Tab-separated table of C-alpha atoms in Angstrom:
chain	number	residue	atom	x	y	z
A	18	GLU	CA	124.095	88.541	117.581
A	19	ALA	CA	122.439	91.427	115.743
A	20	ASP	CA	123.479	93.771	118.552
A	21	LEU	CA	127.065	92.661	117.924
A	22	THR	CA	126.709	93.422	114.211
A	23	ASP	CA	125.417	96.905	115.039
A	24	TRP	CA	128.362	97.393	117.403
A	25	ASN	CA	130.657	96.345	114.543
A	26	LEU	CA	129.194	98.760	111.995
A	27	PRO	CA	131.120	102.043	111.627
A	28	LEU	CA	129.633	105.476	112.284
A	29	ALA	CA	130.405	107.632	109.256
A	30	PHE	CA	131.010	111.393	109.660
A	31	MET	CA	130.422	111.207	113.449
A	32	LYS	CA	133.579	113.044	114.535
A	33	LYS	CA	134.221	116.426	116.133
A	34	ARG	CA	135.363	117.918	112.815
A	35	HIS	CA	131.872	117.698	111.271
A	36	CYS	CA	129.718	117.803	114.415
A	37	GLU	CA	130.695	121.088	116.100
A	38	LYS	CA	130.984	124.646	114.824
A	39	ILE	CA	134.456	125.755	113.723
A	40	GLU	CA	135.178	129.100	115.396
A	41	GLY	CA	137.907	130.754	117.420
A	42	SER	CA	138.295	130.476	121.174
A	43	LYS	CA	136.645	133.292	123.111
A	44	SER	CA	138.882	135.719	124.972
A	45	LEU	CA	138.592	136.165	128.735
A	46	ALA	CA	138.629	139.013	131.255
A	47	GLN	CA	142.028	138.368	132.802
A	48	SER	CA	142.965	140.847	135.535
A	49	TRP	CA	145.675	139.037	137.529
A	50	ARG	CA	148.446	141.420	136.427
B	644	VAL	CA	155.497	126.158	94.182
B	645	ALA	CA	152.232	127.478	92.723
B	646	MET	CA	151.495	124.284	90.759
B	647	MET	CA	150.269	122.442	93.876
B	648	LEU	CA	146.917	124.230	94.253
B	649	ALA	CA	145.041	122.417	91.478
B	650	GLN	CA	145.724	118.955	92.924
B	651	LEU	CA	143.750	119.333	96.172
B	652	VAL	CA	140.456	120.357	94.530
B	653	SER	CA	139.490	116.665	94.419
B	654	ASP	CA	139.529	116.270	98.214
B	655	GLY	CA	136.123	116.080	99.873
B	656	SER	CA	137.288	117.803	103.070
B	657	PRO	CA	135.376	121.125	103.118
B	658	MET	CA	137.859	122.633	105.581
B	659	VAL	CA	140.782	121.793	103.294
B	660	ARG	CA	138.877	123.434	100.431
B	661	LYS	CA	138.258	126.617	102.437
B	662	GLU	CA	141.923	126.771	103.422
B	663	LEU	CA	142.816	126.164	99.767
B	664	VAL	CA	140.745	129.217	98.826
B	665	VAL	CA	142.592	131.191	101.508
B	666	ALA	CA	145.895	130.005	100.024
B	667	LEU	CA	144.697	131.091	96.580
B	668	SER	CA	144.012	134.554	97.992
B	669	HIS	CA	147.432	134.709	99.656
B	670	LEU	CA	149.154	133.666	96.420
B	671	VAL	CA	147.191	136.038	94.178
B	672	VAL	CA	147.597	139.085	96.441
B	673	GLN	CA	151.172	139.452	95.133
B	674	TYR	CA	150.567	138.884	91.384
B	675	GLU	CA	147.122	140.423	90.999
B	676	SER	CA	147.893	142.153	87.688
B	677	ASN	CA	147.979	138.989	85.569
B	678	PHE	CA	144.726	137.649	87.019
B	679	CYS	CA	143.035	141.034	86.583
B	680	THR	CA	144.088	141.142	82.927
B	681	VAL	CA	142.936	137.566	82.315
B	682	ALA	CA	139.586	138.179	84.022
B	683	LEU	CA	138.973	141.372	82.050
B	684	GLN	CA	139.783	139.430	78.878
B	685	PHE	CA	137.377	136.631	79.858
B	686	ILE	CA	134.459	138.947	80.713
B	806	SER	CA	149.221	128.843	81.798
B	807	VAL	CA	149.504	128.376	85.559
B	808	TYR	CA	147.359	131.451	86.196
B	809	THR	CA	144.677	130.279	83.756
B	810	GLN	CA	144.292	126.947	85.553
B	811	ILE	CA	144.411	128.725	88.919
B	812	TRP	CA	141.485	130.862	87.760
B	813	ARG	CA	139.728	127.712	86.532
B	814	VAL	CA	140.038	126.017	89.925
B	815	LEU	CA	138.854	129.283	91.489
B	816	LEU	CA	135.768	129.017	89.274
B	817	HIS	CA	135.279	125.420	90.411
B	818	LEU	CA	135.608	126.403	94.075
B	819	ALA	CA	133.034	129.143	93.488
B	820	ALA	CA	130.704	126.374	92.266
B	821	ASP	CA	131.315	124.407	95.469
B	822	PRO	CA	128.031	123.040	96.889
B	823	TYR	CA	129.397	123.723	100.383
B	824	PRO	CA	128.180	127.236	101.328
B	825	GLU	CA	131.310	128.425	103.144
B	826	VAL	CA	133.890	127.713	100.434
B	827	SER	CA	131.562	129.170	97.803
B	828	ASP	CA	131.025	132.337	99.856
B	829	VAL	CA	134.766	132.766	100.393
B	830	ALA	CA	135.282	132.344	96.644
B	831	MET	CA	132.628	134.975	95.892
B	832	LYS	CA	134.305	137.425	98.263
B	833	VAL	CA	137.758	136.652	96.846
B	834	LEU	CA	136.765	137.094	93.196
B	835	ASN	CA	135.980	140.789	93.707
B	836	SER	CA	139.675	141.464	94.398
B	837	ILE	CA	140.560	140.568	90.777
B	838	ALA	CA	137.713	141.512	88.432
B	839	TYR	CA	137.237	145.060	89.745
B	840	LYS	CA	140.957	145.925	89.945
B	950	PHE	CA	144.038	148.776	97.293
B	951	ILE	CA	142.956	145.413	98.723
B	952	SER	CA	139.225	145.290	98.003
B	953	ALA	CA	138.575	142.071	99.965
B	954	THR	CA	139.716	140.608	103.285
B	955	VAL	CA	139.602	136.937	104.290
B	956	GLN	CA	140.419	134.842	107.356
B	957	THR	CA	139.414	131.594	109.043
B	958	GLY	CA	139.813	130.202	112.542
B	959	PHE	CA	141.077	126.666	111.957
B	960	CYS	CA	144.222	127.131	114.050
B	961	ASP	CA	142.435	128.660	117.052
B	962	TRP	CA	139.785	125.933	117.022
B	963	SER	CA	142.582	123.353	116.978
B	964	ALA	CA	144.351	125.172	119.828
B	965	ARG	CA	141.121	124.763	121.807
B	966	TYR	CA	142.270	121.151	122.332
B	967	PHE	CA	144.565	121.797	125.299
B	968	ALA	CA	141.943	123.524	127.476
B	969	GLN	CA	139.939	120.343	128.106
B	970	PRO	CA	140.877	117.780	130.778
B	971	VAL	CA	143.620	115.369	129.735
B	972	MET	CA	144.078	113.167	132.817
B	973	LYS	CA	140.527	111.781	133.070
B	974	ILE	CA	138.530	109.094	131.281
B	975	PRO	CA	135.660	110.604	129.240
B	976	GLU	CA	132.192	109.902	130.595
B	977	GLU	CA	131.333	108.459	127.174
B	978	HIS	CA	133.562	105.453	127.963
B	979	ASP	CA	131.962	104.697	131.344
B	980	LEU	CA	130.007	101.437	131.167
B	981	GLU	CA	127.003	102.863	133.050
B	982	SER	CA	126.503	106.266	131.391
B	983	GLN	CA	123.295	107.083	129.537
B	984	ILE	CA	125.197	107.019	126.227
B	985	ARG	CA	125.880	103.286	126.486
B	986	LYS	CA	122.325	102.592	127.660
B	987	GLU	CA	120.795	104.505	124.747
B	988	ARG	CA	123.091	102.876	122.187
B	989	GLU	CA	122.336	99.410	123.570
B	990	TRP	CA	118.581	100.044	123.603
B	991	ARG	CA	118.603	101.331	120.017
B	992	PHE	CA	120.614	98.285	118.936
B	993	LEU	CA	118.087	96.088	120.755
B	994	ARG	CA	115.259	97.795	118.856
B	995	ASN	CA	117.034	97.204	115.543
B	996	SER	CA	117.745	93.572	116.449
B	997	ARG	CA	114.103	92.978	117.394
B	998	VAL	CA	112.938	94.499	114.107
B	999	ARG	CA	115.345	92.270	112.176
B	1000	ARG	CA	114.419	89.171	114.191
B	1001	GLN	CA	110.647	89.440	113.789
B	1002	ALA	CA	111.057	89.366	109.992
B	1003	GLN	CA	112.127	85.712	109.942
B	1004	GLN	CA	109.173	84.645	112.091
B	1005	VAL	CA	106.784	86.701	109.952
B	1006	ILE	CA	108.023	85.280	106.650
B	1007	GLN	CA	108.753	81.656	107.608
B	1008	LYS	CA	105.295	80.929	109.080
B	1009	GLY	CA	103.953	80.620	105.541
B	1010	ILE	CA	104.265	83.397	102.967
B	1011	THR	CA	102.366	86.396	104.312
B	1012	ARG	CA	100.144	88.326	101.908
B	1013	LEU	CA	99.928	92.105	101.503
B	1014	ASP	CA	96.162	92.411	100.978
B	1015	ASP	CA	95.786	95.189	103.588
B	1016	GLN	CA	96.444	98.687	102.244
B	1017	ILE	CA	97.508	100.789	105.236
B	1018	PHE	CA	98.363	104.173	103.712
B	1019	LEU	CA	97.329	106.129	100.615
B	1020	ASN	CA	97.698	109.887	100.134
B	1021	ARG	CA	98.760	112.555	97.642
B	1022	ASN	CA	101.369	115.314	97.687
B	1023	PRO	CA	102.493	118.225	95.490
B	1024	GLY	CA	104.882	117.125	92.765
B	1025	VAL	CA	105.553	113.748	91.201
B	1026	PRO	CA	107.174	111.326	93.689
B	1027	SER	CA	110.525	110.708	92.010
B	1028	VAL	CA	111.989	108.390	94.667
B	1029	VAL	CA	110.766	106.765	97.884
B	1030	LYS	CA	112.806	105.222	100.697
B	1031	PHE	CA	111.831	103.392	103.881
B	1032	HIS	CA	113.142	104.433	107.270
B	1033	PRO	CA	115.004	101.223	108.210
B	1034	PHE	CA	113.746	101.068	111.819
B	1035	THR	CA	110.745	103.407	111.960
B	1036	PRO	CA	107.308	103.167	110.284
B	1037	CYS	CA	107.819	106.156	107.993
B	1038	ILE	CA	109.036	106.914	104.476
B	1039	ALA	CA	110.910	109.737	102.764
B	1040	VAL	CA	109.624	110.773	99.328
B	1041	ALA	CA	112.012	112.968	97.351
B	1042	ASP	CA	111.701	114.811	94.046
B	1043	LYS	CA	114.028	116.892	91.863
B	1044	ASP	CA	114.730	119.309	94.724
B	1045	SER	CA	112.514	118.633	97.779
B	1046	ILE	CA	111.798	115.913	100.342
B	1047	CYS	CA	108.723	115.050	102.416
B	1048	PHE	CA	108.512	112.631	105.349
B	1049	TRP	CA	105.304	110.640	105.844
B	1050	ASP	CA	104.449	108.114	108.554
B	1051	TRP	CA	102.333	105.360	107.005
B	1052	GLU	CA	101.353	104.006	110.428
B	1053	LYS	CA	99.733	107.360	111.205
B	1054	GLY	CA	99.146	108.284	107.581
B	1055	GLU	CA	100.351	111.764	108.557
B	1056	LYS	CA	103.233	113.947	107.423
B	1057	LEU	CA	106.353	114.221	109.583
B	1058	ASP	CA	108.262	117.133	108.017
B	1059	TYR	CA	109.173	118.906	104.779
B	1060	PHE	CA	112.534	120.064	103.448
B	1061	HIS	CA	114.181	121.503	100.338
B	1062	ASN	CA	117.416	120.038	98.986
B	1063	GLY	CA	118.512	123.469	97.727
B	1064	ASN	CA	119.684	122.409	94.268
B	1065	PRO	CA	118.696	124.833	91.470
B	1066	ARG	CA	116.474	124.420	88.414
B	1067	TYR	CA	119.243	123.149	86.117
B	1068	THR	CA	119.821	120.159	88.439
B	1069	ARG	CA	117.863	117.203	89.784
B	1070	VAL	CA	118.216	114.536	92.457
B	1071	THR	CA	119.280	111.289	90.787
B	1072	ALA	CA	119.108	109.052	93.873
B	1073	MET	CA	118.449	109.010	97.609
B	1074	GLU	CA	119.908	106.827	100.344
B	1075	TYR	CA	120.047	106.401	104.117
B	1076	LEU	CA	123.263	106.291	106.138
B	1077	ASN	CA	124.067	104.902	109.601
B	1078	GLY	CA	120.724	103.166	110.079
B	1079	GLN	CA	121.845	101.387	113.249
B	1080	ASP	CA	121.989	104.607	115.300
B	1081	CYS	CA	121.592	108.318	114.459
B	1082	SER	CA	120.785	107.746	110.800
B	1083	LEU	CA	121.721	110.419	108.261
B	1084	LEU	CA	120.392	111.138	104.771
B	1085	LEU	CA	122.295	111.314	101.481
B	1086	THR	CA	121.386	112.896	98.144
B	1087	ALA	CA	123.097	112.575	94.760
B	1088	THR	CA	122.878	115.485	92.314
B	1089	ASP	CA	123.156	115.057	88.549
B	1090	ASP	CA	125.807	117.826	88.531
B	1091	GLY	CA	128.038	115.031	89.923
B	1092	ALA	CA	127.591	116.136	93.531
B	1093	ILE	CA	126.803	114.504	96.870
B	1094	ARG	CA	125.152	116.054	99.932
B	1095	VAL	CA	124.469	114.729	103.436
B	1096	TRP	CA	121.878	115.841	105.990
B	1097	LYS	CA	120.970	115.258	109.636
B	1098	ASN	CA	118.184	116.272	112.038
B	1099	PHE	CA	115.496	115.584	109.420
B	1100	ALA	CA	113.480	113.290	111.732
B	1101	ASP	CA	112.671	115.382	114.811
B	1102	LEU	CA	109.530	117.493	114.542
B	1103	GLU	CA	111.023	120.196	116.793
B	1104	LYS	CA	114.382	120.532	114.990
B	1105	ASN	CA	115.475	121.859	111.605
B	1106	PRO	CA	117.603	119.579	109.387
B	1107	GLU	CA	121.295	120.398	109.053
B	1108	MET	CA	123.881	119.547	106.417
B	1109	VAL	CA	126.761	117.189	107.232
B	1110	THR	CA	129.000	117.111	104.145
B	1111	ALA	CA	128.822	118.162	100.506
B	1112	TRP	CA	131.120	118.016	97.497
B	1113	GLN	CA	131.309	117.487	93.739
B	1114	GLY	CA	133.757	114.858	92.522
B	1115	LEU	CA	132.375	113.408	89.279
B	1116	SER	CA	131.216	114.709	85.906
B	1125	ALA	CA	121.408	107.674	84.294
B	1126	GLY	CA	123.173	110.875	85.318
B	1127	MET	CA	124.877	110.127	88.638
B	1128	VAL	CA	124.631	106.737	90.365
B	1129	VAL	CA	125.791	106.139	93.939
B	1130	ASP	CA	126.034	103.029	96.117
B	1131	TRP	CA	126.923	102.754	99.801
B	1132	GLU	CA	128.442	99.948	101.888
B	1133	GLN	CA	127.883	100.491	105.608
B	1134	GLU	CA	129.461	97.121	106.411
B	1135	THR	CA	132.455	98.041	104.250
B	1136	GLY	CA	131.934	101.718	105.108
B	1137	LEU	CA	132.676	102.948	101.585
B	1138	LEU	CA	130.887	105.071	98.992
B	1139	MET	CA	131.053	104.197	95.295
B	1140	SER	CA	129.960	106.402	92.411
B	1141	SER	CA	129.677	106.457	88.627
B	1142	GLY	CA	127.500	107.922	85.888
B	1143	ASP	CA	127.335	108.435	82.121
B	1144	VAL	CA	131.049	107.654	81.806
B	1145	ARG	CA	133.497	104.728	81.725
B	1146	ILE	CA	134.752	105.417	85.270
B	1147	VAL	CA	133.897	104.236	88.788
B	1148	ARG	CA	135.291	105.963	91.876
B	1149	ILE	CA	135.474	104.952	95.537
B	1150	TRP	CA	135.529	107.238	98.577
B	1151	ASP	CA	136.093	106.750	102.302
B	1152	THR	CA	134.215	109.096	104.623
B	1153	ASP	CA	136.828	109.026	107.395
B	1154	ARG	CA	139.836	109.986	105.260
B	1155	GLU	CA	137.697	112.149	102.919
B	1156	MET	CA	140.059	111.170	100.069
B	1157	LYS	CA	139.328	108.967	97.075
B	1158	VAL	CA	140.579	105.433	97.701
B	1159	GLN	CA	140.374	103.860	94.236
B	1160	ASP	CA	139.420	104.638	90.640
B	1161	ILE	CA	138.502	101.779	88.296
B	1162	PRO	CA	137.903	102.384	84.570
B	1163	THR	CA	134.907	100.524	83.191
B	1164	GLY	CA	137.198	98.717	80.730
B	1165	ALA	CA	134.461	98.583	78.105
B	1166	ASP	CA	133.751	101.362	75.610
B	1167	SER	CA	130.174	101.948	76.846
B	1168	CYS	CA	128.838	104.002	79.739
B	1169	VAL	CA	127.329	102.573	82.927
B	1170	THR	CA	123.590	102.518	83.650
B	1171	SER	CA	123.439	100.840	87.074
B	1172	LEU	CA	125.875	99.368	89.577
B	1173	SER	CA	125.706	97.274	92.744
B	1174	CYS	CA	128.403	95.356	94.592
B	1175	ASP	CA	129.110	93.100	97.576
B	1176	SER	CA	129.971	93.695	101.229
B	1177	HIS	CA	133.674	93.175	102.063
B	1178	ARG	CA	134.133	91.142	98.847
B	1179	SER	CA	135.813	92.349	95.671
B	1180	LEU	CA	132.994	91.536	93.227
B	1181	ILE	CA	131.705	94.730	91.587
B	1182	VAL	CA	128.757	94.195	89.224
B	1183	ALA	CA	127.867	96.855	86.655
B	1184	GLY	CA	125.461	97.162	83.734
B	1185	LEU	CA	126.523	98.924	80.545
B	1186	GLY	CA	124.708	100.680	77.719
B	1187	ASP	CA	125.637	98.000	75.162
B	1188	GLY	CA	123.628	95.276	76.919
B	1189	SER	CA	126.626	93.627	78.610
B	1190	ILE	CA	127.000	93.000	82.347
B	1191	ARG	CA	130.508	93.172	83.810
B	1192	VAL	CA	131.871	91.780	87.082
B	1193	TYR	CA	135.215	93.141	88.302
B	1194	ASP	CA	137.642	91.974	90.991
B	1195	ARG	CA	138.776	95.294	92.458
B	1196	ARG	CA	141.760	93.728	94.259
B	1197	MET	CA	143.971	93.171	91.213
B	1198	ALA	CA	145.314	95.708	88.733
B	1199	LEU	CA	143.148	97.461	86.158
B	1200	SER	CA	144.162	95.045	83.393
B	1201	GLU	CA	143.200	92.058	85.568
B	1202	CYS	CA	140.296	93.899	87.221
B	1203	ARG	CA	137.615	92.400	84.970
B	1204	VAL	CA	136.700	88.828	85.897
B	1205	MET	CA	133.146	87.931	84.537
B	1206	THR	CA	131.028	89.039	81.494
B	1207	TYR	CA	127.395	88.290	80.616
B	1208	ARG	CA	126.003	89.037	77.142
B	1209	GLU	CA	122.445	87.710	76.808
B	1210	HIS	CA	120.220	90.785	76.560
B	1211	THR	CA	120.433	92.663	73.266
B	1212	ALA	CA	119.335	96.130	74.419
B	1213	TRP	CA	120.784	98.269	77.202
B	1214	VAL	CA	120.570	96.951	80.761
B	1215	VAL	CA	117.439	98.242	82.488
B	1216	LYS	CA	118.452	96.860	85.891
B	1217	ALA	CA	121.140	94.653	87.413
B	1218	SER	CA	121.725	93.625	91.020
B	1219	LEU	CA	123.916	91.280	93.062
B	1220	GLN	CA	122.556	89.372	96.057
B	1221	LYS	CA	124.620	89.327	99.254
B	1222	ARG	CA	123.193	85.917	100.196
B	1223	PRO	CA	125.578	83.105	101.216
B	1224	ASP	CA	125.733	81.911	97.588
B	1225	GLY	CA	126.289	84.752	95.150
B	1226	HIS	CA	123.542	85.394	92.611
B	1227	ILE	CA	122.875	88.103	90.025
B	1228	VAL	CA	119.489	89.303	88.757
B	1229	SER	CA	119.238	91.393	85.590
B	1230	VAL	CA	116.548	92.700	83.251
B	1231	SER	CA	116.634	94.649	79.982
B	1232	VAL	CA	114.187	96.124	77.481
B	1233	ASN	CA	113.989	92.611	76.020
B	1234	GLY	CA	111.722	91.769	78.967
B	1235	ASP	CA	113.818	88.769	80.060
B	1236	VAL	CA	114.405	88.696	83.818
B	1237	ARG	CA	117.537	86.542	84.030
B	1238	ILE	CA	119.208	85.015	87.089
B	1239	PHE	CA	122.901	84.094	86.888
B	1240	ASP	CA	125.547	82.653	89.190
B	1241	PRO	CA	129.079	84.114	89.446
B	1242	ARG	CA	130.674	80.746	88.611
B	1243	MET	CA	128.734	80.300	85.346
B	1244	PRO	CA	128.671	82.406	82.154
B	1245	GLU	CA	124.962	81.811	81.404
B	1246	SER	CA	121.675	82.693	83.070
B	1247	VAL	CA	120.618	80.165	85.695
B	1248	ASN	CA	116.933	80.955	85.137
B	1249	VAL	CA	114.714	83.132	82.944
B	1250	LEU	CA	111.272	84.621	83.585
B	1251	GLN	CA	109.022	87.284	82.081
B	1252	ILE	CA	106.296	89.637	83.291
B	1253	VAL	CA	106.076	92.176	80.450
B	1254	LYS	CA	108.468	93.593	77.861
B	1255	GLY	CA	109.836	96.682	79.593
B	1256	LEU	CA	109.424	97.427	83.300
B	1257	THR	CA	109.094	100.629	85.309
B	1258	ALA	CA	109.890	99.160	88.745
B	1259	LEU	CA	111.616	95.959	89.870
B	1260	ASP	CA	112.313	95.014	93.486
B	1261	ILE	CA	113.894	91.992	95.174
B	1262	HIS	CA	113.662	91.130	98.855
B	1263	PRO	CA	117.072	90.966	100.593
B	1264	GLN	CA	116.651	87.688	102.501
B	1265	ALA	CA	113.436	86.202	101.112
B	1266	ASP	CA	112.079	84.512	97.988
B	1267	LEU	CA	110.082	87.579	96.975
B	1268	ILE	CA	110.180	89.733	93.833
B	1269	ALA	CA	107.841	92.628	93.017
B	1270	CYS	CA	107.197	93.961	89.513
B	1271	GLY	CA	104.936	96.777	88.363
B	1272	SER	CA	103.503	97.366	84.901
B	1273	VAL	CA	102.780	100.456	82.826
B	1274	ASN	CA	99.251	99.040	82.392
B	1275	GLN	CA	98.523	99.817	86.088
B	1276	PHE	CA	99.118	96.126	86.874
B	1277	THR	CA	101.517	95.122	89.637
B	1278	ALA	CA	102.362	91.826	91.276
B	1279	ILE	CA	104.563	90.041	93.794
B	1280	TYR	CA	105.849	86.547	92.954
B	1281	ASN	CA	108.506	84.133	94.124
B	1282	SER	CA	111.831	83.893	92.313
B	1283	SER	CA	110.427	80.727	90.701
B	1284	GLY	CA	107.593	82.735	89.109
B	1285	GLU	CA	104.793	81.515	91.383
B	1286	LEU	CA	102.329	84.348	91.949
B	1287	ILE	CA	101.704	85.584	95.493
B	1288	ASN	CA	99.859	88.902	95.105
B	1289	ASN	CA	98.187	90.729	92.211
B	1290	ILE	CA	97.176	94.398	92.349
B	1291	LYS	CA	95.713	97.038	90.038
B	1292	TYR	CA	96.407	100.735	90.578
B	1303	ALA	CA	100.968	104.531	86.242
B	1304	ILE	CA	103.499	103.386	88.846
B	1305	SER	CA	106.499	105.707	89.137
B	1306	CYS	CA	108.318	104.130	92.099
B	1307	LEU	CA	107.899	100.845	93.955
B	1308	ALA	CA	109.891	99.314	96.797
B	1309	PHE	CA	109.868	96.716	99.568
B	1310	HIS	CA	110.389	97.039	103.309
B	1311	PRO	CA	113.644	95.280	104.282
B	1312	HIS	CA	112.437	93.510	107.445
B	1313	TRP	CA	108.657	93.640	107.965
B	1314	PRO	CA	106.913	92.745	104.670
B	1315	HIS	CA	105.483	95.959	103.229
B	1316	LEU	CA	105.275	97.419	99.725
B	1317	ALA	CA	105.342	101.139	98.909
B	1318	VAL	CA	104.063	102.330	95.524
B	1319	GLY	CA	104.004	105.916	94.267
B	1320	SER	CA	102.316	106.676	90.963
B	1321	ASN	CA	102.893	109.323	88.273
B	1322	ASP	CA	99.763	110.913	89.871
B	1323	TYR	CA	101.526	112.242	93.041
B	1324	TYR	CA	99.735	109.402	94.929
B	1325	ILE	CA	101.802	107.328	97.431
B	1326	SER	CA	100.437	104.188	99.130
B	1327	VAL	CA	101.708	101.344	101.309
B	1328	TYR	CA	100.512	97.757	101.771
B	1329	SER	CA	101.241	95.781	104.939
B	1330	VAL	CA	101.040	92.251	106.322
B	1331	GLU	CA	97.571	90.694	106.086
């Protein structure tokens, strides 16, 4: 089935490393102390 | 320890390259005097370190190049004049904030992701399926011209959108998207490469779903782009790197999921997108450079044409000494074109300046058949799964025949590029006059 062949084909470059911006994690307004 | 930096320049991973630049900065901050002296002299570990710094400055990827530009100022003008940092570790640490004890919605068998993927695959399957019915009901003829329009700049290369009635026409540095069903433009983009460079080839990637675009630059570079189809979105780069010195020739294997590259050298190199590291490097074996190259899906046969008129077939499984397996020497001049068919029985089609279109089988050392259209060709095209071959002429004559030579269509237009449509019989022709046209079924 052609659908099966499409399912078998790989998806190049489609991983989180290339797809989303590489930046630091935002700080937060912690006040529990 | 310092000798390790030069080895990782060959990796395609842009993040590794940026971190490598950061490591260069951290190493040079302590021994700046030698690099300052060398740079002032230029206006052997340190010499090669400076050379790889130069290479990283010439990185097509904007971020590594920018970091290199900022870093260089700390040496030439010498106090720490430049400061650098990147957030790889924090982005990685972001991992533990997300849920860990739940199945992602993407793996649910009723989410919209699965539905959209299945529907797109159904569209692709329907497009593929209708081709057999169209072709096998009696050879269809392309008498109906559907699209014909002009654009600024000579059309260097044209490619069909595999599952959408539109084409991408690219030149030295820019791309335009035109829908031949509408006859209207879709979008415009600039590759970004400078005057001293040109685009040697264009290709599509991931045509089954969320297709991307690829460009090869004669500087030995490769670039990838996405979001070039939507009218409401700007295209974005995916990956970019220079790994090699006809200029640059690139082939892709979606089924095998591997990129292969060569050029005006005796070398062929293979890359895997997932690992971002070169997988294999095969010397040409012969003493002549390569002009064109095409290979098979999941099979070891690699077919290449050389500048001495010989055609080589390699078995990439074995060692380099045993790599070569099959040689053809019939044409006298350089190989104008050579291609391998992925049909159930392997076949090879080649043509040279001699004007002899020759068809060979892998298990024989001589051409199975010979035909001629005219001595010297500007465009040659072969249908993937049909008995169809299209050939243009410098005399404004073009035609489509069977592989047996029987004529099917004759046309008079100066043809620069000419190509088929993989599934639904169509023919796209762009002339040296900036004019691009398409012919469709009946």
